[PDB]
Every structure is written in structure tokens, then in C-alpha cells.
């Protein structure tokens, strides 16, 4: 059964750091890619980055210097970390499995509100 479940901090103050966890079930992280996508309130999807099965990573050009993606194959967890939060970082964050040019399974997302 493939399952992706994101857990995040909920509200966080601006300038802090954020860490989101994508826990995956039913498949192996060495075999698939994991992409991170966010959805700003009332707007569309924004591609953040991904980590391939081999550990290589890629990131959105605009946010690259504030993002890090990593994973623990033994814990079956993918992490997203973002520095120097802005209030406009408020959004729903999603992890999605990639296979053969498609994001076939998605988590339900975690909402992050940047506020103080």
C-alpha cells in the first residue's frame, strides 16, 4: 500500500527554521524519488525540490539557498528544512513520490503558518 504522511511544526515565528518530516510506507526510498511541493493560500503548486533514490538532490532556483532536503533510508523518512522563514512561507507542504516522470502518490500535506 504506498503511504506518505507529513508532520510539521504548525505555527512558527519568522526568521526561525522549519523542519518537515515525510514518513513513507509501502516502498523503498532507494527505489523512488521524493519531491517537495508547497501550496500558498489561495494559490497554485510550487515545486521546491526533490531527492533521488541515490541521494542526489535538486532545488527550486529561487529558494535553493534557504532549502535542504535529506532522508534516512533506514527510518524511511525524507526531510525538508527551510531557513530564515518569511510570513510568505505560510503554505501547505507536500511530499510526493516520483516514478517514471510522474508524481503518482502524494501525502495529504501539512500546514505551516509563519507568525509572531
Amino acid at each position: 500500500q504506498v503511504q506518505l504522511q507529513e508532520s510539521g511544526p504548525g505555527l512558527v515565528a519568522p526568521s526561525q527554521s522549519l523542519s518537515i518530516t515525510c514518513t513513507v510506507s509501502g516502498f523503498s526510498l532507494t527505489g523512488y524519488g521524493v519531491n517537495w511541493v508547497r501550496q500558498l493560500p489561495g494559490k497554485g503548486l510550487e515545486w521546491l525540490g526533490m531527492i533521488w533514490g541515490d541521494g542526489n538532490t535538486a532545488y527550486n532556483s529561487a529558494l535553493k539557498s534557504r532549502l535542504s532536503i535529506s532522508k534516512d533510508n533506514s527510518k524511511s523518512q525524507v526531510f525538508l528544512e527551510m531557513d530564515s522563514l518569511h510570513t510568505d512561507d505560510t503554505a501547505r507542504y507536500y511530499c510526493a513520490r516520483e516514478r517514471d516522470y510522474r508524481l503518482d502518490y502524494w501525502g495529504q500535506g501539512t500546514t505551516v503558518t509563519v507568525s509572531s
Binding site: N35, V37, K43, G44, L45, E46, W47, G49, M50, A58, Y59, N60, S61, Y94, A96, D100, Y101, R102, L103, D104, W106, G107, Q108, G109
Partner: protein
């Protein structure tokens, strides 16, 4: 970095009507283009990949076409279940990006 633009941004339609939504790329995507549907409070769902292939269990009323920088999603005789937002995404090299979305309302 290829930007994708969708049109129209919004569309009102009635059940049974037939619609077409467009995704334009600022650069050649070489057919590595997918479509997703997202209903309110739910995560996006894959519909079509590599321009024309339907994902599993996607109804035959959906069809994609395109090449180069222009792609389209046609929905034949809309069903109540089809209202929602529609997004295109490319897979040409990295980074990847999504178009702005099209909102289909009843």
C-alpha cells in the same frame, strides 16, 4: 528554468459540457508534461503523464495532447466530480515547475 502558464485561470461550465485547458511552456518541454487535478482540502491527483497517457482509473472522458511549448487537457461532457483545480507540470531536466492552475467551477 521553464515557466508554465495556464489558461484560462478560471472557467465556469455545466455538467455534460466539453472543455479544453491549456498549458504553455516558456521553453521546449519535449512532451515530459503531466496533469493533476486537485479538489478542495485534498492533495493533487495524477491524471495524465507524458502528455497523453492516462493514469490508472482515470476516466476516458479526459484526454491530453501537445508537444513543444503548447499542451492541452480536454474534458468531454463534464461530470460533477470534475470540478476542481487543474495543474500542468513539466519534467524536463531540473528544476521542475507547475503552471498556475485552472479553476473549473460549476
Amino acid at each position: 528554468d521553464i515557466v508554465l502558464t495556464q489558461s484560462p485561470a478560471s472557467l465556469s461550465a455545466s455538467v455534460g459540457e466539453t472543455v479544453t485547458i491549456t498549458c504553455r511552456a516558456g521553453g521546449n518541454t519535449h512532451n515530459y508534461l503531466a496533469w493533476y487535478q486537485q479538489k478542495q482540502g485534498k492533495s493533487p491527483q495524477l491524471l495524465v503523464y507524458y502528455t497523453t497517457t492516462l493514469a490508472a482509473g482515470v476516466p476516458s472522458r479526459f484526454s491530453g495532447s501537445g508537444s513543444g511549448t503548447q499542451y492541452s487537457l480536454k474534458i468531454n461532457s463534464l461530470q460533477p466530480d470534475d470540478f476542481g483545480s487543474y495543474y500542468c507540470q513539466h519534467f524536463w531536466s531540473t528544476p521542475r515547475s507547475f503552471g498556475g492552475g485552472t479553476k473549473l467551477e460549476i
